[model samples]
Target: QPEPDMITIFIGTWNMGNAPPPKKITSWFLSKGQGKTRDDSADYIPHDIYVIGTQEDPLSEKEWLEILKHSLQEITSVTFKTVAIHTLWNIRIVVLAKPEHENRISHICTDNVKTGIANTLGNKGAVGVSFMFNGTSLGFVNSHLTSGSEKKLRRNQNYMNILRFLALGDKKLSPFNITHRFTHLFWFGDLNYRVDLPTWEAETIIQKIKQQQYADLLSHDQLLTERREQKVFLHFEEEEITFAPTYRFERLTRDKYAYTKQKATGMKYNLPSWCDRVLWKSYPLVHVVCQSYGSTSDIMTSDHSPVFATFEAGVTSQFVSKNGPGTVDSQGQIEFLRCYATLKTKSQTKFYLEFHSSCLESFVKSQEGENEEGSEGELVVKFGETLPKLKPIISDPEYLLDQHILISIKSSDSDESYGEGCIALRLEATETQLPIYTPLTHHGELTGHFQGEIKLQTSQ
Candidate 1:
C-alpha cells in the first residue's frame, strides 16, 4: 500500500533540437501506446508534480509556457501551477506542482551555470530549480553537456562545473555549493554522452535493437562507464534501461534513427545513442520508488524522443500542535532561515556536508517514519570536489528553530561518514555569531573546521 504522504512525480527530458512545441503532444505526457486517437481511460495519469527539462527549445520562454499550459490542461483535470522555471540559453527546466500543494510548498530556488565557450556561453550547461514540498526538499537539474563520442572527459568536466558554479539563494552567496541541499535531487537532460563503440559496431547494434538486446549496448554506454569509474554522477542512481535508445531519431519518423553514411568509409554520422536520461539521488531515510522509466516513442517532431520517469516520493506531513493531536495537517507555520557558512577542509579532499535541526516536533511529523524511532535532522548541503574554501548558503524552510543542529561529512568517493559535529542555533539572537572555527571530530580527532552566520525570515 502506498503511504498517505507519498506523492507522484513525473519527470521528462528531451533534446528538442531547436524545435518548437507541436499542437498536440499527448503521447509525450500520457503513455507510449497513446493511439492515433486518445482513449478516454488513458487520457491522463495525474502526478502531484511534473518536471520537464528540455534542450534546444527554440521557442521563447513565454511561448513555451503558453504552449505547455495548453497541452497540460488538455491532458489532466488537475491544475498544475508553475512552481519554478529556469533556463540557461537553450537549456531549460520547468517545474509544476498540483494546486493542492500550493500552500505546503515553499523556498523555491533556481540557478544556472555556463560551461560553454570559455565558460561565458550558455549553449552547453545546466539550469536547475528546487523547492520544499510538504517539508521535504526536492531539486531538479537540466543539463546539456558537450557532445561528441570522444568528449566523455569534457562532459564529465561540464558536470563538475555545474556542481561547482550552480549556486542557489542570495547574490552574496553566489558561490554556494551543489543542489544536494534537498532531500531528493533529480538530474535530467540531453547529457550528450555517447556509446563507447566503434561506428560499425554501433551501426550493427541499432539493427539488433528489435531483438531486445540492450545489454550489449548498455555495456558500452559512456555515462555508465564513467559512473562506474567514479568520474561523474558519483552518488546518483538510475533505473535499468528497459527501452531502446532515445536519441538520433529521424526528424519525420518515430522509430527510425538518424544516420548519414560517410562518403569515404561506411561509418555513420549522428550515431544512435541514449543521449537523454533521468537520474536521481535521495537521502537514505527518504523512500523514493521509480514506478516507470521509458521514452515517449509516439512523438517524432525532433531527432530525439522524450525520456520520462515516474517516481513515488515519501514526504512528511505538517503536524498540528495544540489544536489537535499531533496529526497530519498542512496548517502549521513554515519559516525560512537563510544560513551562510564557511567550510575549510583539507586542501584537496572531496566530501559532502549536511546540516539539520533536531527540534521540529511542533512543525513536522515525518509520515513515513512516524512510528519508526530516531530523528535525522541533517540537510544535505553539498557534494563537491575538494576546494580550498567554500561558502555554502541555504534558505531551507524546514530547519528553522532554536535547537541543536546536526552536522556530518561523508567522503565523496566512499559514502562513509568522515566526521560529525553539532551546533546550537539561537534563532532569537539579534546578532548571529559562531566560533571562528568549530572542530569536526572523527574518531576523537579534529578532521575539519567551520564557521557560520545565520539570518532568519518568515514566510507569508
Candidate 2:
C-alpha cells in the first residue's frame, strides 16, 4: 500500500573488466551526500526495488553478490531481498525488492541471449528479467554489445540478435518479443559504442569535460547517432549527459582516462567513450520520471565506471476481494479471532504461507496514541502433506482483527514459483458456518491443484 501509484526503482550497470569487486560499493548505491554522511535526508532517496547488471566480473558470482547485498543493507533501514538473478558467463542481472512488496510482484521470469561467435558463445550478449509489479509490467535487459571504435553496425546487429532471440517463462506471457511486451523496459550495460571522432579530437573533448562543456562530445556518440537513425535501441530514451564518459578509464586510477596508446607503434588509438550507459522506454500511458542519472567516478577498481539511474515508475492498482463474506464490527471493519489451521498444495516445492500476525498489544498500543505495528510470521506447510497447527505464543481468542492478513505462498528452496491470496478475519453469520475453500492464483490465473483454505472457529 506504499505509494499506491508510483514505485521508485534503482537501475545500475557496470563492466568490471574481469576485475575483483571492491570491498565497499556505497557510492554506487547511495547519493553522494548519503554515501559520505551515512545519514538519511532529502538527498537520500531510498528505492522500492533495485535491478543491477554487471559484465566481466572476474570473481565468483556469489562473492560479488554478497558485496552488493552488504552495501544495500548498510545504507538503508529496510530489508532488501533478491527476488531473481540470472547469469550468462561473465554477465549477470539481479532483481531485489522490499520484503513487504514481494507478494505484489508476480509473473517473474529470467532469460539470456548469446550474440558472440555466431550466437554460439556467451561472451557478448544480454541477460533479461521481467515481472509484474503492482499491476505494471516491467522488463530489464543487461547487455554487452560488440566492442570496437568502428563497429557501430556490428553493435546494432548484436542488439537486434538479442531482441529477436531472448524469450522468458511462458510463451503466452511474452509473445513476439520482449521489446513491446513490457510497460516499462530498461536497457543498460557496456554497449561498446564509442565516440565517433579521431583519437586526438576525442581527447580534446575529454579535457573540456572538466569545465562542464561537453555538449559537443555527445554530438559524436555512436549510440545516440544510431538511436536517432533507429538502427539500434529504437524508442529508447536517455537522460542528458551531465557526467563524463564512463569507459576507457585508467585501471585502478581515480577519474583518469586511459588515453589513446599503442604498445607496438606508440601511435594514437582507442578514443574514450561513454561505453557504459542506462536507457529506458515506456508505454504511452505510463509516466516514468528519471530523478537522477550519473556515473560513480569514485569507483576505481575497473577500467569502466558504473552508471546508475533512479526512476519513479508509475503503476495502476485494482482491488479484488479474496476472503469469504463475513460480519462487520462496530467500526464497520471485519472483526474475528487470530485463528490458525493446516494447509495443503499440489506441488512438492515446499511451499509456505506468510502473513502479518496481530496480538493484544497491537490493539492496546494503538489506543494509547501509537500506530498499529503488527509483526509478521511464516507457516511452513508442505505441498503434499498436512501441516501441524500454528499457534500464537500468547493465545488471545478475543484479539479483534484490525488488518487483513496477506497470505502469500513461496517455496522455501526456490524463487521460481509464487502464489498469493488474501484473508479478512471476520465472523460467519452465526459463528457456526463452515469455512469456505479459497483459491490461490498467479496474476489472477488459478494454479491447477495448488489449492488451500483456512478453517475458522468462533471463540465461545
Candidate 3:
C-alpha cells in the first residue's frame, strides 16, 4: 500500500493550574504514561509529532517537556523538540519530529499585537498553532473562555479581535478571504458555556457561523448514538465511578480560617455536559471518522476532560507521467525519472497480490466456512457454483482440473477438508503462475509401434 495521504491528529486540552514538578509528573503518567492499556502504544500516540495546550505553570511546562522528550526518545527513531507559544501566563506547546518537513509546523502569531483576544478574567488564555502538510495549511485555536457574565463579552470580543488582527497583519482589504485559504481549521477549547436555555441560545450565534463556514465534527445524532452504545454520559450525571467533576468550589471547608476555608466536592461532576469541543472546516481531501466531545475515562488531570476526534486524511492518486520515448526538455525528463524511481518492482507486485488474495480468502472462510463442514457433497456443489467465474482467468484447463481433483481428494480423505476446499483454492491461486500447463512429453517405445509422424496443435 502507498503511504496514506491523510494523517491522524489527536486533539486534547488539559488545565494545569499552578502545579509544578511531581504533580506535572503525575499528570503525564496518567495521560500518555499509562500507555497502551486501551490500544497499542503506537496506535494510541504514534505520531512522530504532537501538540498540546494549557501548560499553566511555566516551571511545570518546562518539566513536562523534558519528561515528554525522554519518554518519546525510548521508542521514536527521530529526534524531537517542543515549541512553546509565548504568552503572559499559560503556555501551549507543539511537539515536532526533528529534521522537520518543509511544510510542517507549530506556529503562534505574536507579531500581530492583538489585545482583548486574551481572556481578561482568567490568566490570559489564548494560544494558537498552525500546521501545514502537503500543500495545505490548518490552524488550531485553543483557549479558555471567560466564566463570568460581565467579562464574557469582553473575552469573546478580544478573541475575535485577535483573529481579526492575525488576518490583517499583512493588511488586506478583507480578512475573511485571506483566512479562508487555509485547507482546514479547527477551533477547540473549553468555551465555558453551560446548557441553561439562555446560554444555549446565546452560543447559537457562534454555532451558526461555524456551521455556515465549517462542518461541525460533532453532531447531536452522533452524541445520542455514542451515549446509547458506550453508555458514557451525554450530559454530566451524578454517578460515582472514577469520573471527576471539572470544577471545584474551594471556599466551604474550614472554621477558624472561615474567610479562606475550602470546600472540595466532586458531587456535581456526573452532569453530562461539555464545554470542550472540536470543530473543523471542510477540506476537499479530508474525512472525519470519529469525534468525541469529551475525553477518555482515564482523563483526570484537569477539570475539563480532553476532547478529540479521529480523521483519515485522504490519499490522492495521480497518473504516472511519462515523457514520450525521447523527450528533450530537462524538467519533463527529470519528472519522468522521479516517477520511475518510485514504481513497484515485479516482486513487490506479486507479494501485494498474494497478500490481498490470502486476506480475502481468510475473511470469507471465517464468515462462511462452517456451513459446508462435514458435507463433502455440499462442498463440491459450492465449488461448482464458484469456479466458473475464476476459471477463465487461470488460462489452463489441465491445471484447473488438477486443482479441482486435488481438492476433491482432500475432501474425500477427511471430514475436516469438506469446508476447507476454499482455503486450498486460495493457496493454489497464490502458488500457481498465470500459465498452468507444461509441454507434452513423449515416451520411448519400440520402433515398430508407430510408423507415421503425428502432429498436435493447440491454441494457448
Candidate 4:
C-alpha cells in the first residue's frame, strides 16, 4: 500500500424540505475511527470523504451555496486540502478529501436533468459528479425521486432518468457521463419509494418496530422489492435500516408521521417510509463491507431525517503473502506439485480486493474442473448460494448474497482449493497472443480503467 489506501467514506442523504441548513454542519458525519462497530462508535478519527446528497429545495442564491459550502469547509478539522461541490436545481452534492489524496481526485464534472417540468422541475432529477482517486474512479449522485408511494413507477422512472442523464458523457461535463464510467457509485436522496403496507397496518408494524421487530415493515419497502425485481436501481446495495424511517416526519415532534402535524388530507397523506436512503455499488465491486449505517437522531432541520452510511473501502491492506500450492513457470503452466507447494514467485505483485474488514478471511472462492478433453485448460471460479462459503472473515452488511465483487488473479490457489488444483498446464504455456493489457472504455470518453471488476450481480 504505497499510498494512504484505507479510507472511510460517509455518505449522507436527506430531504431538506426547502429548509436552510443547520448553523453547524459537523453533526452529519459518523463518529470518527468507529469502523464496523455498530455500538457506541468508540475510536475517533476523521473520515476521508464526505459525500452529501440533499433534496427538496436546496438553496441556489448567489451566496447561499457559498455560505453552506464555506460552513462545511470550516466545520471540519481543516485536514482536507480541497473541496468540490455541485448543485442542480433543488439537489446538491459535495465531495471533500484530505490534502494528501486531493491530487488523486480529478476529471470532476456535473449534469443536472430537470424532472420537475416533465416529472416536470425538481420531478426528481439529480446533480451528478465523478472523480478519480487512489487508482479508482467513482460517481456520486444527489438525486430526488418522484414523491408519493402511489406512484412507485414514477420514482423508479426517475431512478432510470438519473442513470440516462448520468450516462450521456458529452461536451465538458465529466470524468465520464456513463454509469460504468466509474468503478464505484454513491447515490442517495429522497427516493420517495414507500412501504407497501397501509398507514394503519404500517403503524401497527411501526409499533412493533418500537420493540425493534421491523421485518414486517422493511419487507414492505418498494425499493427493495423493485430492486430485487431489477425494475430500477439494479444491483444497488444498502445497509440494514437499523434506525427509524427517514421520511414524512413531523417538524416539531420529529418522530411521528407528518400527517400527525396536520389534519389528514388524502389517501397517501404523509405516508411514512424509508424514502431517504444511501445506496452504493458498481465499484469496489465485491463483498462490500460497510462499517456503519444509521440515521442522525439530533439533526432536525429537515422534515426527513438524515441517512448516513460508512464504508470500509479503499484497496485491501492486510495480506497474508504465501507462495503456496500453485506456480506459474516460464512456460506459464501452473504446476500444482504439492498439497501446498512453496514457490519462487515474486512478492512484488498486488493481490487485493474489495472486502468486508470483518470478513477478511472469507476469501470468496470459485472453481471448475473438466474431465480430460472437455475443458482441460479452462479454469473457472464460481460463487452462489450453493457454492461452499469460506469465511476467513465475519460480517453483516444487510444487503449480502446478491453483490458485486472485484478479485485480482495473482496466480495462486486459495487455501480451500489447495490440493484439488489442476487444468492450467496446457494453455498456460501456449498463450503468447493474449495481451497483458486490456483497454476499457465507457460512454464517449476513454476511462482510465486499468482494472475491470467482472460485474456479476448474482443473487444467492
Per-residue CA lDDT of model 3 for 37-147, tens digit only, reads 223344324453355555354455466667556655554544565543434456453434444442344332332223442343445455665544533355656666554
Which segments of candidate 1 are over 4 A away from where they belong? 1-4, 33-43, 117-122, 169-176, 261-268, 320-355, 358-460
Candidate 4: stretches off by over 4 Å: 31-44, 57-76, 79-82, 116-119, 167-177, 260-267, 284-287, 315-460
- Greater-lDDT candidate between 1 and 3: 1
Model 2 RMSD in angstroms? 16.6
| Model 1: pairs clashing at backbone N, Cα or C within 3 Å | 355-379, 356-377
Clashing residue pairs in candidate 2 (N, C-alpha, C atoms within 3 angstroms): none
The worst-scoring run of ten residues by lDDT in candidate 3 lies at 333-342
Score every model by TM-score: 0.69, 0.66, 0.44, 0.63
Candidate 2 runs further than 4 Å off = 1-3, 31-45, 118-122, 173-175, 263-268, 318-460
What TM-score does structure 2 among the candidates reach?
A: 0.66
Comparing 3 and 4 on TM-score, the stronger one = 4
Number of the top-ranking candidate, with TM-score as the measure:
1
Residue 362 of model 4 has an lDDT of 30
Query: Candidate 2, after superposition: displacement of residue 190 in Å?
Result: 0.5
- The digit string of per-residue lDDT tens for model 1 on 1-460 reads 2224688888889888787756787666664531122234745767788898999888787888777777778888666789988888888888888777788788788988889575536478999987777656688889999887778899988888887677653232211244334567898889988777777665687776767678888998999998988788866799887777777877767767765555632363656778988899765446798877887766778888888787889776543333233332233222213222223343334455554432332211111101111134222233222211211122233333322334555545564555555544434442233232244544323444444444333221
- What C-alpha root-mean-square deviation, in Å, does candidate 1 show against the real structure? 11.9
Error of 3 at 253 (Å): 16
lDDT of 2 by residue, 307-396 (tens): 888888877553222221121222222222222322234344444444333211121100101112223332323332232233322222
Worst 10 residues of 1 by lDDT: 365-374
